[PDB]
Amino acid sequence: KPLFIFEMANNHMGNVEHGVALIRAIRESCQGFDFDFGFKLQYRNLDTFIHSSFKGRDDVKYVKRFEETRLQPEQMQKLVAEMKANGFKAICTPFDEESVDLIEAHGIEIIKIASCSFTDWPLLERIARSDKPVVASTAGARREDIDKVVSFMLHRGKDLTIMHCVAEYPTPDDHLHLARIKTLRQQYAGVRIGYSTHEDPDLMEPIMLAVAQGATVFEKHVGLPTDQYGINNYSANPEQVRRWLAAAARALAMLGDGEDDAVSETEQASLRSLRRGVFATRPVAAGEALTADNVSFAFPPVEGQLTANEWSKYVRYTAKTPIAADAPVMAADLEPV
Amino acid sequence: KPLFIFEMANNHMGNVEHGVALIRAIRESCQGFDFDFGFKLQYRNLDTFIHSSFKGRDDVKYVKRFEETRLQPEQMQKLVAEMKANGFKAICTPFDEESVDLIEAHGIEIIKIASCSFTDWPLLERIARSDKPVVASTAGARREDIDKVVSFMLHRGKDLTIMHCVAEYPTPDDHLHLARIKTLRQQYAGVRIGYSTHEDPDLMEPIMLAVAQGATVFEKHVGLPTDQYGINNYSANPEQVRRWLAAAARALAMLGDGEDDAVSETEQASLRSLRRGVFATRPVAAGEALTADNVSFAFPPVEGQLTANEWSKYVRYTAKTPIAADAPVMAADLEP
Numbered sequence: 290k291p292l293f294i295f296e297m298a299n300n301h302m303g304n305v306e307h308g309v310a311l312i313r314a315i316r317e318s319c320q321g322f323d324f325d326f327g328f329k330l331q332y333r334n335l336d337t338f339i340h341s342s343f344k345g346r347d348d349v350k351y352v353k354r355f356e357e358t359r360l361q362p363e364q365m366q367k368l369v370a371e372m373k374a375n376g377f378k379a380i381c382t383p384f385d386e387e388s389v390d391l392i393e394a395h396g397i398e399i400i401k402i403a404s405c406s407f408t409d410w411p412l413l414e415r416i417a418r419s420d421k422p423v424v425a426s427t428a429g430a431r432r433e434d435i436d437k438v439v440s441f442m443l444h445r446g447k448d449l450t451i452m453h454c455v456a457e458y459p460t461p462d463d464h465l466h467l468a469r470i471k472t473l474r475q476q477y478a479g480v481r482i483g484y485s486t487h488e489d490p491d492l493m494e495p496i497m498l499a500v501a502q503g504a505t506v507f508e509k510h511v512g513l514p515t516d517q518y519g520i521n522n523y524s525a526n527p528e529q530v531r532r533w534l535a536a537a538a539r540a541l542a543m544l545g546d547g548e549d550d551a552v553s554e555t556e557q558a559s560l561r562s563l564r565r566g567v568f569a570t571r572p573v574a575a576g577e578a579l580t581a582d583n584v585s586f587a588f589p590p591v592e593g594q595l596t597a598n599e600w601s602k603y604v605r606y607t608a609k610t611p612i613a614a615d616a617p618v619m620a621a622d623l624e625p626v
Numbered sequence: 627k628p629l630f631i632f633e634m635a636n637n638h639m640g641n642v643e644h645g646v647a648l649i650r651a652i653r654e655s656c657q658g659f660d661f662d663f664g665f666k667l668q669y670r671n672l673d674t675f676i677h678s679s680f681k682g683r684d685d686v687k688y689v690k691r692f693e694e695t696r697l698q699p700e701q702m703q704k705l706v707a708e709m710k711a712n713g714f715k716a717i718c719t720p721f722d723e724e725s726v727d728l729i730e731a732h733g734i735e736i737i738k739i740a741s742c743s744f745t746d747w748p749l750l751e752r753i754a755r756s757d758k759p760v761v762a763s764t765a766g767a768r769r770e771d772i773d774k775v776v777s778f779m780l781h782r783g784k785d786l787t788i789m790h791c792v793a794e795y796p797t798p799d800d801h802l803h804l805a806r807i808k809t810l811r812q813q814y815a816g817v818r819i820g821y822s823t824h825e826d827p828d829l830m831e832p833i834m835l836a837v838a839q840g841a842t843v844f845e846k847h848v849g850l851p852t853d854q855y856g857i858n859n860y861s862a863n864p865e866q867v868r869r870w871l872a873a874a875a876r877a878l879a880m881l882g883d884g885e886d887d888a889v890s891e892t893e894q895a896s897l898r899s900l901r902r903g904v905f906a907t908r909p910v911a912a913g914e915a916l917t918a919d920n921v922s923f924a925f926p927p928v929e930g931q932l933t934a935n936e937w938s939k940y941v942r943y944t945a946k947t948p949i950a951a952d953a954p955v956m957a958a959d960l961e962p
């Protein structure tokens with residue numbers, strides 16, 4: 290049931306072979322874990338998306354990075370092909386209306402909304418008229434906005450998932466604000482809650498904290514280090530992904546199931562072995578009632594001596610058969626009153 | 627603020643001076659942290675609590691250990707004194723009703739109830755007569771019991787805390803069942819929840835998990851390995867107590883404040899730089915309306931271009947002054 294999502298973003302680096310080699314290593318990292326898994330792309334129609342005025346420029350963030358790692362629809366369909374080949378849910382973040390169109394053509398199963406497009410209303414309209422599940426990130430979103438967006442998606446019957454994240458790239462430990470996962474969970478009932486992250490140096494605890502807080506979907510950026518290919522400071526390599534899942538794996542075990550009222554057999558005998566048994570202080574005749582004079586409490590009990598945990602201060606029991614003084618009051622020897 | 631209770635139990639090994647040195651070793655472990663701390667004893671009037679039928683016997687668990695580590699009241703009084711002097715809160719688990727009297731006499735501040743005495747009504751009824759906050763452990767209680775005891779104390783006006791714990795000494799990782807913390811927060815709303823634990827072969831993650839589920843009171847057994855005395859495996863030394871607390875602190879750091887909605891400049895400025903700005907696709911006369919006909923969306927914007935995230939179907943825009951084809955719609959040029 291937990292779903293983990295692996296964000297490639299642009300870490301294919303403009304290169305498909307690399308990106309195929311990265312999906313396949315991520316599948317290797319998943320060996321043995323019993324979760325759901327999705328792989329994520331980012332769709333921008335670079336023609337429309339980067340404005341004429343900013344083409345070829347680098348005096349501002351992201352333009353150059355976007356232009357350099359550009360991939361053609363032909364090649365983007367190729368990656369989906371592998372994604373699915375390996376058993377990943379194909380997941381994608383459109384930033385354009387036209388990229389939604391494209392997501393459809395590619396038979397992608399799910400739509401992520403990035404935090405930046407969270408209130409990109411025209412983009413939302415385009416997504417709403419789609420018929421796939423939605424995963425929305427909410428970094429620095431106002432409550433009133435997330436409300437609008439939740440309400441609007443939920444009305445008109447969408448499968449929605451809302452994710453905590455922070456738009457600091459990478460995110461200081463100081464600054465993960467994981468408490469927010471619960472804030473979101475409490476604000477919005479019957480909406481899946483998740484956590485998308487820019488934490489990683491190889492951290493490991495945030496995920497446990499995240500699971501504990503009742504997030505059910507988890508997104509992390511991934512990439513494959515290589516000689517002549519670097520990695521950024523918020524993207525995990527295949528070695529740290531496996532660890533990432535090992536951590537969640539552990540946290541689930543340590544957490545157990547909150548459903549279980551059910552009780553261990555150790556616990557029960559242990560607990561008895563520390564309880565106070567009820568003893569007669571004085572001979573008690575047949576049909577004598579048991580009172581504050583005549584009994585006392587002391588440990589430890591024998592089976593199935595009546596214990597203090599069953600005593601009452603009002604008159605509850607008479608002795609069916611006589612009890613010797615200083616003897617354990619056995620519970621099979623008492624008729625209730 | 628979070629409360630950390632250190633369970634001494636009978637880890638004073640029956641020696642007052644050792645108990646003292648323990649308290650002192652643990653005060654050091656606490657240096658620097660902005661938490662509350664308590665040290666906890668275990669009170670049993672043994673003359674009376676261990677039944678004659680069982681005195682001198684090592685035939686079944688605990689009897690021996692209790693007898694062997696016996697401390698007199700004057701000696702318990704010295705420990706409480708020490709605890710207070712290092713600025714610890716004084717806490718105790720009484721197991722019989724004479725022990726509650728001694729708690730009152732010794733000036734102990736909080737009453738802990740062990741899981742085995744959780745439904746010990748006669749003890750409960752004695753404990754209810756004190757006016758000390760109650761902290762209550764819950765291992766293997768059935769729901770109806772927790773319900774009963776909970777309302778019992780709450781209706782009495784008690785300042786109650788409910789702990790999750792597990793009666794396996796020590797508790798396997800497998801078996802911590804840390805999500806009872808959430809369960810219990812959810813069934814007993816308003817009631818403070820903590821977690822008392824019997825875990826570590828050095829474990830640091832469960833406290834981080836405890837804290838993340840909103841436990842606020844934590845208990846752990848503690849000891850001072852000495853070679854003259856060893857230490858059992860569900861109780862922690864001073865080194866590993868600091869680690870424990872550091873794990874807690876780190877978790878709080880990573881969690882931050884649920885009720886804080888202030889967003890950063892760094893964050894806000896980050897988001898803007900990935901957003902679609904708004905560009906005029908044909909010329910736009912002054913006092914002319916802006917529609918889907920005349921605007922495209924593209925990236926990136928600049929201070930302070932209109933942004934798409936402000937293209938609501940509920941909002942009309944008219945140009946103050948004329949806008950050229952292919953130009954940024956600059957907000958200061960419109961009319962909400």
Ligand SMILES: [Zn+2]
Nearest residue numbers: 296486487510
């Ligand atoms: Zn991201």
Ligand SMILES: [Zn+2]
Nearest residue numbers: 633822824847
């Ligand atoms: Zn204990």
